[PDB]
Write a protein that binds this ligand. Structure first.
Ligand SMILES: [Co+2]
Length: 154
């Protein structure tokens, strides 16, 4: 899907109300720890009332940490990663989709990290969200995405 254009929030779809605010807050958190938003997030997509931040694997662990700990984000719930494979998407054929939810601020977003079949590694985020352990494990079983740092790999 094509890159969403600002504003991500749309008046006629309440479901998107907080998208621009969440996006801003995420840019701010990463600047604060010395990471340009554009270097960490490659693309934002808005489809059927859901926002997806396409995150670079290199920076997934930091983004996740910032999403959980920053008071302006506070995503406590990690619904569980899901794998998706695109044979025609050369160099980025293995994707992982993470639905996250913030009860505090009443937000919902998705992260989406990809990696090539030639180097199928995405960092585990069990350190941040323990719940994600089995989901990463299942993503590995079916797709072959190696979740570096996963408890089972020590
Ligand atoms: Co493949």
């Amino acid at each position: 899907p094509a890159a969403a254009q600002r504003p991500y929030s749309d008046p006629s779809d309440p479901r998107t109300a907080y998208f621009d605010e969440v996006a801003d807050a995420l840019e701010r958190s990463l600047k604060e720890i010395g990471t340009p938003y554009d270097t960490a997030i490659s693309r934002v997509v808005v489809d059927r009332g859901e926002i997806t931040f396409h995150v670079q694997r290199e920076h997934l662990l930091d983004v996740a940490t910032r999403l959980r700990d920053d008071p302006a984000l506070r995503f406590e719930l990690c619904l569980g990663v899901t794998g998706v494979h695109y044979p025609e998407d050369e160099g980025n054929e293995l994707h992982a989709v993470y639905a996250l939810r913030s009860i505090t601020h009443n937000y919902e977003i998705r992260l989406e990290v990809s990696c090539p079949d030639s180097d199928p590694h995405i960092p585990s985020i069990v350190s941040v969200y323990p719940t994600n352990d089995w989901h990463e494990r299942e993503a590995w079983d079916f797709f072959g995405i190696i979740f570096d740092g996963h408890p089972a790999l020590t």
